[PDB]
Design a protein around this ligand. Sequence first.
Ligand SMILES: Nc1ncnc2c1ncn2[C@@H]1O[C@H](COP(=O)(O)OP(=O)(O)CP(=O)(O)O)[C@@H](O)[C@H]1O
Ligand SMILES: Nc1ncnc2c1ncn2[C@@H]1O[C@H](COP(=O)(O)OP(=O)(O)CP(=O)(O)O)[C@@H](O)[C@H]1O
Ligand SMILES: [Mg+2]
Ligand SMILES: [Zn+2]
Ligand SMILES: [Zn+2]
Lengths: 242, 548
Amino acid sequence: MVMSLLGHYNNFFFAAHLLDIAMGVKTLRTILSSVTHNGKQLVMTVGLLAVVVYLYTVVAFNFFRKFYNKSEDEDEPDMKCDDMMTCYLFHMYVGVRAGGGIGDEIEDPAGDEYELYRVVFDITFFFFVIVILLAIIQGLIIDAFGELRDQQEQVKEDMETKCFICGIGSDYFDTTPHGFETHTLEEHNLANYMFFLMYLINKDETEHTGQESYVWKMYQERCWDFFPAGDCFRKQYEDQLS
Amino acid sequence: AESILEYFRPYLGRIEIMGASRRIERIYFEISETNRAQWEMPQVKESKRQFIFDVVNEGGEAEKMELFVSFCEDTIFEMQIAAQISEFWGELEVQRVKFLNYLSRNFYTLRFLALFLAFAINFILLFYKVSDSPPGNMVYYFLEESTGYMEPALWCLSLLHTLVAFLCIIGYNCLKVPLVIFKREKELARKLEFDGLYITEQPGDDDVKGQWDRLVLNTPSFPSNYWDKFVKRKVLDKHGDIFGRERIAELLGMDLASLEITAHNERKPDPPPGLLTWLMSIDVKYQIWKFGVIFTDNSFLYLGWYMVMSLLGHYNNFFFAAHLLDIAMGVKTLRTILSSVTHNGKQLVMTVGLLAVVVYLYTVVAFNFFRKFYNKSEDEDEPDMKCDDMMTCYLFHMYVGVRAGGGIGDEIEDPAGDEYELYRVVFDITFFFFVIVILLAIIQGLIIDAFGELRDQQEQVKEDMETKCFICGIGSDYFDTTPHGFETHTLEEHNLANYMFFLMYLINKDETEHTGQESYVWKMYQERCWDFFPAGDCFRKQYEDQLS
Ligand SMILES: Nc1ncnc2c1ncn2[C@@H]1O[C@H](COP(=O)(O)OP(=O)(O)CP(=O)(O)O)[C@@H](O)[C@H]1O
Ligand SMILES: Nc1ncnc2c1ncn2[C@@H]1O[C@H](COP(=O)(O)OP(=O)(O)CP(=O)(O)O)[C@@H](O)[C@H]1O
Ligand SMILES: [Mg+2]
Ligand SMILES: [Zn+2]
Ligand SMILES: [Zn+2]
């Protein structure tokens, strides 16, 4: 509402509302949930990247100050790595987005002095920043997506292979034809307990059958011993056919 | 008597053993308040979680009880250390003891303080410039704009960082060095008593530990941290008949073995006066062995390297930059992130080796066939030929083609010439397909497979804990017949901490009072026999005929 009121002032304040409402889409919510799943790992990854770039910038400032000249005109005063802050800003701006390291933007290593050291520097820059630290970011998202798939599969399997009220598996109920469906529709049904609670709440204490009054007394004391919790009607009366 | 039962419920412990019959027997004992308080410490819970993870993941079905007893003994030793650190020549000695106890009590807070000092040092050292002329050949000076504040400060922080590093290395020396000494002594004593590593056989080669453990055997101060001080007599009595008594006695020190027997009673020794005696009372060989054991530990070497770099940082250089990477590994989340990369380092290094072999082969092919295209100059009469030599061509390939991302054809000349056009096109296509596409996908897939591997292992460990008993062989489905039967089984009948407190009570009690069942359990523990565990049975299954 604040942004809607500010939009009356002649500006572009109405542009953000598109991102305000697009999160409401369910499919987009499931897509964004994987990125939101491991935000902490992402921010420590960015911190580790910043530390690595700072260390490489320090090494370049100590040893490779002469190669960070980015000018073509003679008598050039444009030295990028004369200061640590400017060199760090240049590294963070260029080397991360370069995709091939710092050697593509720095001077040629064709000089005899400090050639192998600069080659090793460029190889380590390419290997440690571009290759591994982006693969970690991709693998975090892929691991999140699969983790959400495994959790959904486990939730569905738990529903299909359990009773959620009793402790008896479906293998015992599968002796009779469609025994498990009868158990999960009539003997339990959850909605049955919901409607029983509705009937107990609607009925006044004056009118409360003995069993219903006992259930109300257990509910008032917050005692959950009225649930079967590992037993059913069939197991108690297994001697008889019913 | 409900109030009596509720008052003594935390102090009452139960355990189910099997001994002296073919039936399960219950033993009730007393749990101390301080042991229960020490059990609830987060470090003890983290050690327990690590032990459970190691047992479930890599530990087999067999020998689980031996690892459980070893973990229990380590927990007892940690509790003893925490009890001892808990809080004029004599005044100076008590001040030194108090300072050592204070340093031992606060160890990780000083570590975080060292991290804060390193961050402050890096933040101050951010402002640092170089100039060709001295301020007010090239010189280095900080254009901080705040005169006289940072140059003086970073020196207070340097001295404080050195002092904190020294205090942390002292705290590590007095704190966790004792556990590894106790573990090494216990392992050596058990190997000598039960395995006969030096009595029957010999660890002649492929072990640096077997050769290094020979120095402490002859020292009279062999039992220092281990509880049993009679291991040498037990070994002598065990191997006195098969092997020569004199040889086994001489190999384990034990001078004047005949005089050790109390049948003589010739004279009683007199106490020496404790002046200057401390110089002679030390054992040089034992201290050398202990120093070698300390030098063997990885964390001691890490702290020594940290202190060396801290001392070198006083010399005006940038030696303080690496400390950020030294401490950032201590973060748990960063540790779990880096563990996936550390999980498959070997596959990565053979991948780099295969990449090097492929680049060498392609460089050889280019040198044999495509030497003319590796000219990287614009000025006429160009002597800059990259692939005139095999070493220079290999260096050029390793520098350019790997980081190019599109192959060697983007940097080499144009294939528009009629001669050797299709061969160079095929060369470029194979370079792009074999290096950039597959060999980076392998690197990414290794990390993703490591992450999936760690997720599957954690899921398996948790599922094994939820679906098993970890002591008996009965699943939770049998215990789930009664309401909350599995919770009652896993809290009262087992509980692990119950066995830990039973071991505490057995250790604290002297052999004189051991009740018959407790004496039997002590006798089985002395012989290292683990048949007192149920291992597939419980109280309910034995007495299934009755309701209780
Ligand atoms: N007491 C109970 N115990 C165990 N499962 C129960 C249950 N009550 C319902 N269910 C489970 O619900 C599962 C399927 O129902 P679901 O939750 O998918 O409903 P639904 O939203 O698809 C409506 P509909 O199926 O009529 O289109 C059944 O396999 C059953 O096991
Ligand atoms: N003897 C035993 N056998 C099998 N499982 C046991 C056990 N003793 C404890 N557990 C298992 O440990 C699990 C619970 O302990 P948990 O590891 O959650 O402790 P905790 O560190 O989280 C303290 P809290 O849960 O009270 O905050 C239970 O599932 C239980 O099965
Ligand atoms: Mg799977
Ligand atoms: Zn049911
Ligand atoms: Zn059990």
